[PDB]
Amino acid sequence: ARVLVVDDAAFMRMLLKKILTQAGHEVVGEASNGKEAVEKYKQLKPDLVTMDIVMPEMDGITAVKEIMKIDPNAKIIMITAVGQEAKVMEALKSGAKGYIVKPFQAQKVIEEVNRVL
Amino acid sequence: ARVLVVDDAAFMRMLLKKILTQAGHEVVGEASNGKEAVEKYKQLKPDLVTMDIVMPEMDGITAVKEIMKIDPNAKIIMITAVGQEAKVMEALKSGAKGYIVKPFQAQKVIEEVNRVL
Amino acid sequence: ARVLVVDDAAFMRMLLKKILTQAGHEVVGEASNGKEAVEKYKQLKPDLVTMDIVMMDGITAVKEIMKIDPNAKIIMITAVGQEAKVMEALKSGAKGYIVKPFQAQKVIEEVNRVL
Amino acid sequence: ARVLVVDDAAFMRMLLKKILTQAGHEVVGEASNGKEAVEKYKQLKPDLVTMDIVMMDGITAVKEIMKIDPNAKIIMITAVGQEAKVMEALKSGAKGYIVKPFQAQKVIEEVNRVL
Amino acid sequence: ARVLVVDDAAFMRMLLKKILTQAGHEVVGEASNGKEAVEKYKQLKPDLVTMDIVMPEMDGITAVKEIMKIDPNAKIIMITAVGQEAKVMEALKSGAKGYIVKPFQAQKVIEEVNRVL
Amino acid sequence: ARVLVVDDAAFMRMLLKKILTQAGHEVVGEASNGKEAVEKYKQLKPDLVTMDIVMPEMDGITAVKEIMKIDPNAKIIMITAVGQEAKVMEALKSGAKGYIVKPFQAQKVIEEVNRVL
Amino acid sequence: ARVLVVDDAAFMRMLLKKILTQAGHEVVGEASNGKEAVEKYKQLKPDLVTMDIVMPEMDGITAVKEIMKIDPNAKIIMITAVGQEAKVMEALKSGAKGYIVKPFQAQKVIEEVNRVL
Amino acid sequence: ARVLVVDDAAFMRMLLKKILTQAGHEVVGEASNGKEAVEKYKQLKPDLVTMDIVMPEMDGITAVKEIMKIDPNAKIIMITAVGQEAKVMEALKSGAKGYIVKPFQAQKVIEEVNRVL
Amino acid sequence: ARVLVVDDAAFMRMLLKKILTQAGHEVVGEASNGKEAVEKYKQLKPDLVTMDIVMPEMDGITAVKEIMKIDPNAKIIMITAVGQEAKVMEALKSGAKGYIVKPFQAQKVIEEVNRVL
Amino acid sequence: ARVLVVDDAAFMRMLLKKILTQAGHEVVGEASNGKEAVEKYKQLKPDLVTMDIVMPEMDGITAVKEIMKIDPNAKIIMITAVGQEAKVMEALKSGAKGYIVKPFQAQKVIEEVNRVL
Amino acid sequence: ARVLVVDDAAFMRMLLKKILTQAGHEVVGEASNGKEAVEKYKQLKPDLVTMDIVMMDGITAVKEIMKIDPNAKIIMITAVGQEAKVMEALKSGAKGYIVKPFQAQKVIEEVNRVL
Amino acid sequence: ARVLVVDDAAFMRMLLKKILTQAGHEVVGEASNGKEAVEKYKQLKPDLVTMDIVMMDGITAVKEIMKIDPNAKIIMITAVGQEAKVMEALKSGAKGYIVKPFQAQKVIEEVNRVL
């Protein structure tokens, strides 16, 4: 069978891939999160999917909060896309120190890195 | 000057890594999701984190539902960890056909793969 | 001579208690399940524990029904903490589950999905 | 729409029956254990079965008590057909067993042997 | 002229076998207990059976009790077949320390041997 | 450890012996019925006993009855020891055709074999 | 006109061979089971194949039984993988004297060969 | 010792043969299935047989499918017994060109051979 | 006067060696773990042994972690038996790239070596 | 490739070494325990490491027992840290003749050496 | 495209066979030594041969050891069919031999005779 | 009583070692070929040596095949350090070589060049 292997841990995808291949199956693709598994399913139409039941769920804001609990002096720069300004605002409130804009202009990224350090 | 780079898109991590390295910084690690960013922060104690504001949020159950919308005959095997049985149950209800237990015992994985196919 | 009596059936605890008391022993406490027996053991330090096992399981019944009728429609009832068994029941052919305590609307929604 | 309701608790069968009937379904039969559900399935050919699983087990409780007190004295209660579980309980540290239905003299003889 | 020889004492079967063979008969099988004599009769359809009137009668439970009288610290592991669980239970009650399951899986046999020792 | 292996089937003693030896244990003796296990325990004082839960229980009379059910024309000669005359009598009643006496005198055994055939 | 004849019954192969030859065809090969038919097809590239739909295939246990009928003193070692213990047990019961485990450890193979001889 | 080596996998026979020969034994023959092992036993009278406990069985239908993969223009006639019709149907669907029932008339066998060519 | 010095700490072996030599003794060998002390005793037959009671012993997983600290691009294949899957999983998580199973099949060892390189 | 082979069993290192060499790889070193594998890695910078996941650990007490089996007149002094007294006691019971606590005075070490000789 | 594969290591023949087959070639035969390769060549007439023969012999080793130590004690380990070589080894200074397959008892008897 | 065990098969060294040790001897070393046995003899000075060397070479096989078929196509499989032998094999008529460890791609490239 043609198998899509889904797990956030690269090494776990590799272990499962080895077992599946030894049993005669072909791993036709891999994914590390939910959204990616859906897209790869559409594209590859595998006979079978294996999926870790823990898929990454933690949003940027929560990650900022957790890092700030571990280290109140942490320095975090957010990357924004357009339309997510509300979330960046909240990330800054929760302790992030700045942000940079995609697509990256190298000079502006570096200027912001220097300001934050 | 020691930087942890966090983004779900590999090519975006590579572009940012190149800019940071050219400017004299050392990229000491990378992460593609929130949970991984937190763990890598604890472990690496970087001077600086760059973090995409959109981190993967889709849980396993939602990924199962979405795959089932695309293909009502999809064959999906969940991987369970201990303590997540409620979520596996719901994944099965939402259309997953079976599950395998970590740590993997190859013979049982294959037996479950064969039952599902 | 100090005895902790464990059985899920109240009347069976009472019958055993009567026999033990007539023979000169003191029933110092009672329990109706394993977890409760452990707690009472810590607390009472009895000389002796009597324990009844409560044992065809649900999973086998699901398998047997599916052998008789491969199109059988079975909905499991679970409470919180029994999810491992429901998982196995679903794997063995059950089509869904409903949660105790029952919320009528959710029971009916699941009944309709399964039919 | 024809439903076989399976649960060891009578009152839970009645609560589910009420909800199913109010939603327009017919409860065509009831059972309190797996074996009985299989027999009733053959006989009634229901469109749908609801089945409650009845699940810390006795063996784990024996193990936990033995961790707390390696000299604990535990006597299992078995009926005919549960011998596999008693065997495992004895292996996990229980010192004996008594048979239901209880014969007072044999219970006391076993209590004395174990003490 | 085709003879099934039944006796619990090997040397008695050998003496009888020698006499029968010298007299021109063919010993087509041997058995050392009752159950074995019945099975060998079905299978061999001998013209004649010789059978010691004392066949072994001691059940497993009695053998456990007798060993325990000789040595109260004896360590005995029962082998169970399916359907004999009541007898194993009673053997454990009478002083046996554990049991192993046929067919033997070597790792589990050894684990049980180690637990008992 | 020093192990006494008890099982009515020779091949099962050999299989268990192989597993025990591979794990480092020494099989110091074997027995095929209950009575023999007790005697060997006394004599060998093993650290450990393995014992099949089904030990032969069927007496001579039952074996005669069972053989006669299988083949009403079966020809069975009993071997008697002194003191077991009641059992031989019952074996004859249940369909055995004769008996021979231990210790064997070859001539008398053969005379009885010829009478019965 | 070049024909491969496939049937598990030798007599049926002989009858078909005779008829085909009398009609002017050349029987270029024969096979008595499926696997053999495939191999002979690759190798001989016949114009035509005749093939029985049912080839009955003798398993290891049956082969042990048949060899033991031919020679009651036969010495047979089974080659097994892990997980086949029920079948090994049955093979031993039917008269096999031992077993060796794949993948092979040469030392253990030889040890088992020596024990059996 | 003189050894008959029985295994369906050629490479496994070769590995066992090498180990046996290095230890000083003589592999006097090989077989790849049960029936062949029996015949070789009769003929060679080996001191010892090594025999894989699982022989894989290719059925007629699979053999037809495999031949058709090797040569899509293969010409196959199912010469079979009555009562197999579902399997013959499937063989015909999988590419077999003909069928006859045994016992047959020579004339009709040849007529079917001619139709198929 | 011929002394074997046993201690896991190199500095402690050096200090003891110096003191023993200054006092007129000859240090004929050193060992840093138990197994090594035994072997060196057999071989050197010293008049005297000094021995630390506690030698801490590094397991496979710790060795993987330590090698990965020294060289983050290290390529490590674990050698495991069946039943150790939890430990292999952890070794892979700690940075090992694969595993091979004892007893060795040479072909699979090489296949895994090639995959990892 | 250049390979470092790590396994506590010499014979297992030799089997793996043979397979690797036959396939064209170079075994550049060997180790029998974790600590030794780390040191050899630093020194050899191999392309690849094969490493048994379980390293067996001989403790000091076992090493004392083993030495005493080899030579019942062995002279062993336990040079140890404070807080180990139960284990030293057992070592003395198992035949060690002396003990000193580290850190020590040279003079007292030598005095204990002299007492034991 | 028809290939004869020659290598003394079975697993190396198998690896090369797999690579050749994946590339579209047919492995028509195998051999593990030179003499066997020649015979298989005659018989199979392959388009192509791959060959890895891996080749100091026992007799030379005996001679060299005897030069180093004229009192050396050497036992040859031989199978049937190698008697000419054993003869020569004994002439060159070896003191005995043991025959494969080994009986432990005969090995020990020969070791004792030679010492 | 101090024994050097010489055999190209690891498992045969191990079997002989076990028998020798059970009989009271000490195996002080092992070797898998002649040259190694000589070196180990010098170094260990054993009381006793057991030796099984098992020895047509590749070059002769090439020559014989070329006599049978002057258009034969032969590829040598070599490791590093055997270049002198490959040279001679090519001179005697072999058309190419492949180097261990194999890369599949290089094997195929060489097979295609030679055909």
Residue numbers in the entry:
A (entry chain A), B (entry chain F), E (entry chain F), F (entry chain A), G (entry chain D), H (entry chain B), ...: 2 to 118
C (entry chain C), D (entry chain C), K (entry chain E), L (entry chain E): 2 to 56, 59 to 118
Text taken from the publication that reported this structure:
Here, we present single-crystal X-ray structures of CheY from Pyrococcus horikoshii (PhCheY) in two different crystal forms, and the protein purification, crystallization and X-ray data collection of CheF (PhCheF). The concentration of CheY-P determines the switching frequency of the flagellum or archaellum, respectively. We observe PhCheY to have a domain-swapped, pseudo-dimeric fold, which may reflect inherent properties of the protein fold but is not likely to be of physiological relevance.
In striking contrast to all of the known CheY structures, PhCheY adopts an open conformation in both crystal forms, with the two subdomains of a given subunit directed away from one another. In both of the two PhCheY structures solved in this study, two polypeptide chains assemble by pairing the N-terminal subdomain of a chain with the C-terminal subdomain of the other chain; i.e. the α3/β4/α4/β5/α5 part of the fold of each subunit packs with the β1/α1/β2/α2 part of the other subunit [Fig. 1(a)]. In the case of the C2 crystal form, there are six molecules in the asymmetric unit. Four of the subunits (A, B, D and F) interact with one another in a dimeric-type domain-swapped assembly. The other two subunits, C and E, interact with their own crystallographic symmetric molecules for the dimeric assembly with swapped domains. Superposition of the N-terminal subdomain among the different subunits A, B, C, D, E and F reveals that the C-terminal domain of subunits B, C, D, E and F undergoes a relative movement of up to 57° with respect to the N-terminal domain. In all cases, the rotational movement of the C-terminal domain was calculated after the initial superposition of the N-terminal domain. The connecting region between the β3–α3 loop is partially disordered for the two subunits C and E. For both crystal forms an unambiguous trace of the electron density in the β3–α3 loop was verified by a feature-enhanced map (FEM; Afonine et al., 2015; shown in Supplementary Fig. S2 for the P2 crystal form). While CheY has been broadly characterized in structure and function, a subdomain swap, as observed in PhCheY, has not been reported before.
